[PDB]
Amino acid sequence: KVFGRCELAAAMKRHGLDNYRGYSLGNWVCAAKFESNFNTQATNRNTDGSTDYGILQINSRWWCNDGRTPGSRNLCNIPCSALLSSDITASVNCAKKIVSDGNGMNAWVAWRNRCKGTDVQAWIRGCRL
C-alpha cells in the first residue's frame, strides 16, 4: 500500500508514535517519506546482506527474521514480511523498540541526514489529526 502523507500521519498517531521518545509526528512522517516514499512494500538490500523492510525500512540484521541474514537477530520477534503489510501495526511496534535502543531516531540514517534539524512539522501541515 502506498499511503498518502496525512493518511500515514493519522495511522502513526493512532498507533502512538506522536511524541514517542520525544519525537513529534512530523519526524516519523519525514523518516517514512525518505525511507520508503510511504510504500509499505518497499525493500532494500544492504551491503552486508541484510535487507530493510517496509514504511520505516526496518533491518533484518537486528529486528526481524527473513531467514537469509546470517548471524542476525529478530528483536521485534516478527517475520520481516509482516513489515510489508498494508496494516502498519508491526512496523510501528518494532519502530518503538528501535528508537528506544539508545540512539533515538539516529538509528534511521536517512532521518539523521534528511530530517534531523529540519522543519519536520511541515510533514503534517494541513492534516486533520
Curated annotation (Swiss-Prot):
Q: Which InterPro entries match?
A: Glyco_hydro_22 (IPR001916), Glyco_hydro_22_CS (IPR019799), Glyco_hydro_22_lys (IPR000974), Lysozyme-like_dom_sf (IPR023346)
Active site per UniProt = E35, D52
What residues does the C-type lysozyme domain cover? 1-129
Q: List the disulfide bonds.
A: C6-C127, C30-C115, C64-C80, C76-C94
SMART domains the UniProt entry points to:
LYZ1
**Tissues in which the UniProt entry reports expression:** In the egg white and polymorphonuclear leukocytes.
Gene Ontology molecular function, alphabetical: beta-N-acetylglucosaminidase activity; identical protein binding; lysozyme activity
Q: What catalytic activity is recorded? A: Hydrolysis of (1->4)-beta-linkages between N-acetylmuramic acid and N-acetyl-D-glucosamine residues in a peptidoglycan and between N-acetyl-D-glucosamine residues in chitodextrins
The principal location of this protein is secreted
Q: What is its EC number?
A: 3.2.1.17
Q: Which GO terms describe its biological process?
A: cell wall macromolecule catabolic process; defense response to bacterium; defense response to Gram-negative bacterium; defense response to Gram-positive bacterium; killing of cells of another organism
Give the enzyme class: hydrolase
Binding of substrate occurs at: D101
Q: Which GO terms describe its cellular component?
A: cytoplasm; endoplasmic reticulum; extracellular space
Listed Pfam families: Lys
Keyword line: Allergen, Antimicrobial, Bacteriolytic enzyme, Disulfide bond, Glycosidase, Hydrolase, Secreted, Signal
Q: Where in the cell is it found?
A: Secreted
Q: What does this protein do?
A: Lysozymes have primarily a bacteriolytic function; those in tissues and body fluids are associated with the monocyte-macrophage system and enhance the activity of immunoagents. Has bacteriolytic activity against M.luteus.
Kindly state the subunit structure of this protein. Monomer.
Question: Which family would the database say this protein is a member of?
Answer: Belongs to the glycosyl hydrolase 22 family.
Annotated PANTHER family: LYSOZYME C (PTHR11407:SF28)
In its miscellaneous comment, the UniProt entry states: Lysozyme C is capable of both hydrolysis and transglycosylation; it also shows a slight esterase activity. It acts rapidly on both peptide-substituted and unsubstituted peptidoglycan, and slowly on chitin oligosaccharides.
| Protein name in the entry | Lysozyme C
Source organism of the structure? Gallus gallus (Chicken)
